[PDB]
Structures are given as C-alpha cells and as structure tokens.
Amino acid sequence: DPITILDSSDSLSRLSSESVGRLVVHRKDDLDIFPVNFVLDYSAEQPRVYFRTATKLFSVNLNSDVLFEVDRFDEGWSVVLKGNAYVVRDTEEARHADTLGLKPWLPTLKYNFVRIDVREVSGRAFV
Amino acid sequence: DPITILDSSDSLSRLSSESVGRLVVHRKDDLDIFPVNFVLDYSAEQPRVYFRTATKLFSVNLNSDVLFEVDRFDEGWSVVLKGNAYVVRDTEEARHADTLGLKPWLPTLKYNFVRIDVREVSGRAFV
C-alpha cells in the first residue's frame, strides 16, 4: 500500500531525469557509497550508466558488483540499479561516452569513464 | 585536491540539516538501499540516528551492520555513517524517539523506530 513498485520504463525515465546518483561499492563486507554525476546510455542491448572517476573512490580492488541509486523524497521515489562497473578501455567507447553530456571537469584533472552494465532495475514510490 | 575530508562535527551538523537519508543494507552480498526520513540524536555517549519502518525494507535477516548516507551535489558533499541498526524495544526509548520531530505518518500505519548506533562518521566535499 505505501510502496508502489514502478515499471522498468518509468524507473529508467526517472533515473534519466537526474544527473547525480550514488554508487554503492564493496570490498567483501566493508561498504562505501559516493555520489557521482552520471548519464544513462541506451545504445547497446542493455541499459548502461557512465560516470567519471578522477581519489581512489572506485578502485580495481572493489568488487565490480555495485548498486547505483537515484532518488527524490520529502512522498518520494527511488530507483536502484544492480550491475557490474568497469573502467572503459575501448578508445571508441571513451569517445562515445564523451558525447553523452556529462558535466565538464577542470581541464587539468585526468580521469577515466566507468561503465555500469545493468543487470536489474528496481523502482519504488513511497506514499 | 578535489576531495576535502570534513571534520566529524562539520559532518554531523550537515547530516543534521537534512531530513531524508539512505540506508544501505545487506544480507551477505546482496545489497539494497532505500531513503528514509531520519533524525540525528545526540543524547547518549555516541551519535544515534532514528528512523521508522512501516514493507519488509529493514528486516531482522538483514545484517545489523549498515551504512547511512546523506548528500548534496551539483561541487557537493556527502556524509556516510557506519553503524549497527536495531528495532527499538525499550518503552522509554520509543517514547523518546517520538519527541525528536520525525514527520508524522498516516495515523493507521503501524510502525517501529529503528536506531542506528554510529561507529564511524565520514564526510567529504568534492570540488
């Protein structure tokens, strides 16, 4: 009654309307979470999220298994993605990620894109 | 350079200025995260967070070990608490939690308070 399960399309549209999300990471049982500017990309067979990492926040020793979350609250809603996050590597894919409209950083900070391959989408509204 | 570590007092004041936060829970490696209205309580030897649970979002089979996160982003900041979350039990403590100014729910939804005993506070600002 107080929790409405959203459909996947609704969930992804609403996630798409925000530009800041939270990545939840873990190395075994230590967990951490941090906000990032992201974009949702639809261009492959499955939804993908890209974000940048300048900081050792997302490191190769963290599990690739992550959650990514967006919300808006007061009633409210949240969307949780389950997936696997990887630094990008493909010269063509970095170039592609760079056309998606992430906010430019200071032109001096070197960075990598991280791609999240989305396994699951869960949206909820709470009233 | 892009990450300023905040002091604990700053971190807790900023967390205290918001009324919505995110609980990160886990049962082994499955993780979930959900927003809740919370209040920060200072009245014991350590900081405590209270929130309500109407929904099976926070269940006794989830580990008591949790993170609790508040942020504000664009620059931005986030505060992550590490701790242990328990349903309240003490007739005196429920009564006390009820004076802290959490938003009233619909008068029909039965609920419990959950208390987070805070082990660690991490605040960060990102520029």
UniProtKB/TrEMBL annotation, chains A, B:
A Pfam family recorded for this sequence: Pyridox_ox_2
InterPro entries (alphabetical): Pyridox_Oxase-rel, Split_barrel_FMN-bd
Superkingdom field: Bacteria
Gene3D superfamilies found in the cross-reference section: Electron Transport, Fmn-binding Protein, Chain A
Name of this protein: Pyridoxamine 5'-phosphate oxidase family protein
